[PDB]
Write an enzyme that holds these catalytic residues in place. Structure first.
Site, mmCIF file in Angstrom:
data_model
loop_
_atom_site.group_PDB
_atom_site.id
_atom_site.type_symbol
_atom_site.label_atom_id
_atom_site.label_comp_id
_atom_site.label_asym_id
_atom_site.label_seq_id
_atom_site.Cartn_x
_atom_site.Cartn_y
_atom_site.Cartn_z
ATOM 1 C CG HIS A 1 -1.800 -1.226 1.292
ATOM 2 N ND1 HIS A 1 -2.915 -1.426 0.507
ATOM 3 C CD2 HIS A 1 -1.662 -2.344 2.044
ATOM 4 C CE1 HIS A 1 -3.440 -2.603 0.786
ATOM 5 N NE2 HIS A 1 -2.701 -3.179 1.719
ATOM 6 C CB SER B 1 -4.454 -6.101 0.422
ATOM 7 O OG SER B 1 -4.026 -7.092 1.344
ATOM 8 C CB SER C 1 -7.067 -0.045 -1.364
ATOM 9 O OG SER C 1 -7.190 1.014 -0.451
ATOM 10 C CG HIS D 1 -3.980 0.664 -4.021
ATOM 11 N ND1 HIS D 1 -4.366 1.698 -3.190
ATOM 12 C CD2 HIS D 1 -3.387 -0.256 -3.222
ATOM 13 C CE1 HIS D 1 -4.023 1.414 -1.948
ATOM 14 N NE2 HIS D 1 -3.425 0.235 -1.938
ATOM 15 N NE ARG E 1 -4.153 -12.848 1.503
ATOM 16 C CZ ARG E 1 -4.822 -13.232 0.422
ATOM 17 N NH1 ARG E 1 -5.154 -14.490 0.204
ATOM 18 N NH2 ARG E 1 -5.145 -12.309 -0.453
ATOM 19 N NE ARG E 2 -10.998 -11.505 7.378
ATOM 20 C CZ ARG E 2 -12.211 -11.256 6.889
ATOM 21 N NH1 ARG E 2 -12.788 -12.110 6.053
ATOM 22 N NH2 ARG E 2 -12.850 -10.149 7.230
#
Ligand code: 8N7
Ligand code: 8N7
Length: 190
Positions: A43, A111, A113, A131, A139-140
């Site tokens: 990010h 991920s 956003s 993005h 990480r989930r």
């Protein structure tokens, strides 16, 4: 060029201290998204390495396909793949595709956003997503990112994605000419 594919965690305020992991069902009304979004690392805005080619709701989550196009990043990663003991330390010994293995290992998370779910109640004014990031932390969901030179090979590595879903995904990935995309902003230190 290099393709990336995987299931995403949907995250609002990814950098901020309050991390929100959205349920897919909160954002599926705003999918698919076929226009390119930046792909960055963790990010960080100045680490653009590529562009998304599609975000799609599938039976078992939200699937992202993208291209890694930064020549500076591709040259750096390839050099590390062939010369860095550190980069290769957490990878199985002597792989045939070290570049693919090193990215798969070090950047396993995708991920996406999103704006806050407060804005997803009713109708948002502007773009819902900003993005996709290649991530090492946070990480989930299960499953990991896959990197490859052949988009069809990348998507076919995911058993939870059907041949029908894979064809729908690939319709948009092939129609784009990666050379036509603008150069991401990543600068190599070297
Ligand atoms: O060796 C590594 N980095 C490195 C090490 C020496 C130099 C260097 N060589 N000569 N002078 N400086 C230049 C470097 O570039 C770095 C510049 C910023 O983005 C990351 C790479 C290294 C080792 C393990 C894991 C990672 C993480 C990457 C992230 C993406 C690609 C797969 C893994 N990097
Ligand atoms: O961005 C990264 N590296 C990076 C970023 C700019 C430079 C740089 N600036 N000016 N010249 N080179 C040089 C860099 O690599 C050097 C700095 C850090 O460790 C060795 C090498 C990065 C990100 C995630 C993971 C890793 C891999 C770790 C890093 C720490 C040691 C164990 C492995 N590296």
């Amino acid at each position: 060029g290099l393709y990336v594919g995987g299931f995403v965690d949907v995250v609002s305020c990814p950098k901020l201290e309050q991390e929100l992991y959205l349920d897919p069902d909160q954002v599926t009304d705003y999918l698919p998204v076929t226009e390119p979004l930046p792909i960055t690392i963790e990010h960080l805005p100045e680490t653009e390495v590529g562009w998304t080619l599609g975000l799609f709701q599938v039976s078992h989550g939200i699937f992202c396909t993208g291209a890694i196009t930064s020549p500076a990043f591709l040259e750096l990663a390839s050099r590390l793949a062939d010369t860095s003991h550190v980069a290769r330390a957490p990878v199985k010994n002597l792989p045939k595709e070290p570049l693919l293995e090193i990215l798969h290992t070090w950047l396993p998370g995708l991920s996406l956003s999103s704006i806050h779910p407060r804005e997803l109640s009713q109708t948002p004014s502007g773009p819902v997503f900003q993005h996709v990031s290649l991530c090492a932390l946070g990480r989930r969901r299960g499953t990991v990112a896959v990197y490859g030179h052949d988009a069809e090979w990348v998507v076919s590595r995911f058993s939870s994605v059907s041949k029908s879903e894979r064809a729908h995904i690939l319709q948009h990935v092939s129609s784009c000419r990666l050379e036509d995309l603008s150069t991401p902003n990543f600068v190599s230190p070297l």
